[PDB]
Amino acid sequence: GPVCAEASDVYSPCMIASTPPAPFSDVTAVTFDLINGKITPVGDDNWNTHIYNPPIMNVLRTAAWKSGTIHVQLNVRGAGVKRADWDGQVFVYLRQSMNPESYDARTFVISQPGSAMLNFSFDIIGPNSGFEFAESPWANQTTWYLECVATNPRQIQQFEVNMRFDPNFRVAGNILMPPFPLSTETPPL
Amino acid sequence: GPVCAEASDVYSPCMIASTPPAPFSDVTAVTFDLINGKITPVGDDNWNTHIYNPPIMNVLRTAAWKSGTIHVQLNVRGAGVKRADWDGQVFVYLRQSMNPESYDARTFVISQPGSAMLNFSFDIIGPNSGFEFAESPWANQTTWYLECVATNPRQIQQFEVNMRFDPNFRVAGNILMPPFPLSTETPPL
Amino acid sequence: GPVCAEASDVYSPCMIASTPPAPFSDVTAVTFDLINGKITPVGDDNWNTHIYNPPIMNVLRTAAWKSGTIHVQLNVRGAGVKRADWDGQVFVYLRQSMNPESYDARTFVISQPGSAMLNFSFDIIGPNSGFEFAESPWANQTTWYLECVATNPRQIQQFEVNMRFDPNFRVAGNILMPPFPLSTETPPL
């Protein structure tokens, strides 16, 4: 299929993580808390990370109760490697908790030279009235985590998480947050 | 088509099999009994295997009579190989019986470096009232097997079987099973 | 598009042909008579071939008059070749007659390392009442041929023809056939 399927809508860039600098080279992973807006590498940080303040990201961080669908698009940017030497792979895991007892809600497995895009949606539905308060101790509520595994941090450079609310999204209640640091989008050059 | 088609829903990881360790290198295959939850390599085991306990997997293993559609997604994770040396191929066969007299119900043939995803659905429909009891000696009923052939166990590392019930799924009757061993999801690192 | 489009239905394996053994290496082709169930290589046989007896194949071979749509899926399995050395190509031609005066009804051109799948449908519609008797001398009726050209028999190993009747298929009349030899599916290993 040389012909490209038409993309549309406005998906704003929420959070981005870049792999540990050379000579680091073990398989490494970073996990995004899609709802509370938190990035967490596996301990071997120097996974340089960023959280932006697009509208969607501020609603997600101040809205107490949420109910609706979120449309995500993972952009994977890679180092400049001769295609013939490419061996990188990204393993993606969408889950509701990081305890090992929890199972994945969805799993993707991509592997293509340089760049790749992955699109999927998921939807927040809770006990309050189809509303869910991310990890409230209340009905033992939960959040949505996106774990990404870079199989070769020297070839796969960074993961960019783009999100967009479906029109059916609804929100209720406010959360007292500390001030949000300015976080202007790191340019491409 | 650089643009990715949006995936959705919750597909939980059911069973996973990893190819024989080095220096093993002949074409080898493992076959999943999608319905009873059994993994069977071809004799040259050390196809390290696992069965998980996500909700769908426990319904499948205790529900006596089943009727409905099952949505599957095969994730194929590979060893880290220079793309230029990749020669691996996976041959997938969905069948209702392993006797050689039976023909395949569906056959897939994939071959792509590192990782690959295959999606297909199939549906359980039996003699009881559109209900089928997996391999009951009764109307000479049957089950659903997924045979996967790794053409180069040194490049293709593991097969992950993800499943999801279609909303039309129905179930009836219970099967006395022995206790289910805890089987927490082996992490990606 | 890393995301795979969901396949479904039961397509049973009808006939399979494997390229001439080494050191044979010229461009070679085999042509399937999709309707009467006959395989014919171009003279440089030792294109090892097989015809199976799945239900669809027995209806096709005994049903005198046919009317309806047939869904096909060509699976192409290849030899184990470093992706970097792959040069194989398959050229597919669907036609109603092998006389050189006849033009192709549809033509496909694929070229991908190892394995590839091609899906297309075509439909039988004749003079009897939308019914057609394959190659009956009657209204100078015809059949449906699938010619496949392996451009490098050392890289492209075999062609597997999978078929499935559309629900609109209809059939009438019977053809006295000689007994059908048992032809159990040659396993993948």
Add this chain to the structure above:
Amino acid sequence: GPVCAEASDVYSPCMIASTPPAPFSDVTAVTFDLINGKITPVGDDNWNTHIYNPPIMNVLRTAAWKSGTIHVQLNVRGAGVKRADWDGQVFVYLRQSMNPESYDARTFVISQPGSAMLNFSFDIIGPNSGFEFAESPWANQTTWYLECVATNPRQIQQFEVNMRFDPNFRVAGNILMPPFPLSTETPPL
């Protein structure tokens, strides 16, 4: 999916930019002002550029107020490079302003040898009556910018921006423009 999805409609070529000549080789980018018809490389010009006068381009440049959907298709033509040495990547950013404080409205990330096509649509909707005057100081209105980053100007040769109005496009008011220079389409050879 060897099978190609059918493209259609008339998309006329609006503006084209070619990367700096050898031996230039740093990552470089050019940004298109999709609505006012302006091309702007990042300072290391000799990004040879062109703006054409197809109907759509003249409406865009004289129509004061606009409201509707624009369908875009980015064609990426590359230098003649052995596939095995390809390392190029294009990063695409659709945004409403070039100030660093503004976030992207949509972001694409492609990477494929030689040529690639990207399709997406976006729609103009303003404060006047769903009408928007590109960058009018009035309601602090805006325009639509398409920033393209060539990661290896020696492999990625040029970016061609093709556009087409959706049938819902509407326009109002006229803008006094200076004469438009003839700009016949530079041939492919």
Add this chain to the structure above:
Amino acid sequence: RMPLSIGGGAGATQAFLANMPNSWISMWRYFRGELHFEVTKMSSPYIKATVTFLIAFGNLSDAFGFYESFPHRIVQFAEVEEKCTLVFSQQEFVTAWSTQVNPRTTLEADGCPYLYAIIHDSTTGTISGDFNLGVKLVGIKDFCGIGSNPGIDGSRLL
């Protein structure tokens, strides 16, 4: 204290037991409804006790002296009686709760409701024996399943 977050199954030694109906309700992430329980008097009729049933959270202590400040029922069995039916209406639960909670969830941290069985006075008998009751969730009326449960491996001990 019996937990109402009944997903998974009954706990066992480094394993768990499940059956089709329990596995089925586990498909849902959160749930709610009117619960119907059946209590069976499994001990001899000579062993007597008055139990009171109510719905409350995991963090009340065994010494909490005011369980009867909550809406509750009081059960006593006549010699010949052996069964009792408790129905907890939708008005006893303010929202839906999790079908299943992480196994390592401490009582003080379990945010889902529990069915409580408490001894109102004391167990007695002129014969030795424990007072044994069997408890079964027969079904749920006006059941409501909310969202897909990705799943949690294992279940607390029954």
Add this chain to the structure above:
Amino acid sequence: MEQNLFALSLDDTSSVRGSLLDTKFAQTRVLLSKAMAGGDVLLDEYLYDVVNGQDFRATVAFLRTHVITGKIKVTATTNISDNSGCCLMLAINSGVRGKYSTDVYTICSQDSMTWNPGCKKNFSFTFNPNPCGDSWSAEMISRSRVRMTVICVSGWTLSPTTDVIAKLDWSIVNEKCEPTIYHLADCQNWLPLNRWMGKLTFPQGVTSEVRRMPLSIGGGAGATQAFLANMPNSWISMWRYFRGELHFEVTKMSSPYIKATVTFLIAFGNLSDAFGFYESFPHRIVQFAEVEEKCTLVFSQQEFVTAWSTQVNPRTTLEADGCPYLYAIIHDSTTGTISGDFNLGVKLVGIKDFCGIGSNPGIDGSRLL
């Protein structure tokens, strides 16, 4: 004699109700120092904790009723001599996270009650602690961490001779609980925002004062290399352009001894403070009687010719800001036989006939509030 205990009314599953005497569950004492200042957090804690050492008629019922159906009513009592004043605010938010901001702007979006003890001698309001539904319970608001914060939005114009105490009374009333859910419909007839526009402070004097509040309210309130936002403000930011009938609430936060006549109007950023003809525009004139503390401005759709940007680039100069502003101007002069500034609180309560236009890709940051 012997009864069937199973039959008694012990499973009474009803919500608490009765007279205000029987329906009260807790009281709280908040101390207002004689030198409180504005920003001063007077009491901030989880709502649930308010019920701690309490022993009133409905305390046990509040804690043991599984599904409470009525609203919570808070009544505040306190009062100062007519030559002083200040402005207090009681606010409720569904949660807190981290080292949160307790600025007026941040806390007043969900449910707040704001008054001036020099003008009112008590003030009450009712609220539903569960915005998604029509019922709540003590256990729920406890586990879900609902916050109750009381702050001094503006300090005493003239200090009382002693520290002062406000007594909060918490009761459950028989009003019905109702959700306040936000959705993405381009047109809504009432979008409640409660977005704080600012505290206007006018010094006493023959001078000319002009205050400009921008209507391009996207983003949030500016802060030092950061910004503050709340759910309602973040929600309206989803839209690129917007328009509607704006409803504002102006509170007299200074002592009633400080007097001034302010005139409100809608105009653009480029008028100078010296512009002498602000009253050639359609405008309203506000003056507060001793005992008055609130005023409501409604700017109809006929005051705006088109929609404007939800948010403008932070570096946008006044002369270049093409979106409208709410202007607060001193008509005569601020005076008083006591020292003090004339302080007004301004809040965009909501928008009627709201219209959101297009998706906002976003701009990082916001001008200073």
Add this chain to the structure above:
Amino acid sequence: MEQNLFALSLDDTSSVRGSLLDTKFAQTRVLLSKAMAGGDVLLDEYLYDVVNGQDFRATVAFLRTHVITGKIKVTATTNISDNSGCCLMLAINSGVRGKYSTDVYT
């Protein structure tokens, strides 16, 4: 907003009433030794003290209602196997004086 506090229903002068759940003010535990004998005083104290460490729905109302108009109801719960029995008695008297007799008769 501002209200006339004098007007509110704070002077609610009515007796306590409601379901048995809302109308309960105290519970008491009396211990019957396995060798009690008859004459045995199991619990004897002022009625009022019965309301001491109590924290039930009507405890505060019982204590703060100036004029209670309904009756007090006592419910006792206990039971033994059918081959045993005994006889208990709960009694109320307006007062006691001195080293009083606690015999059934008295």
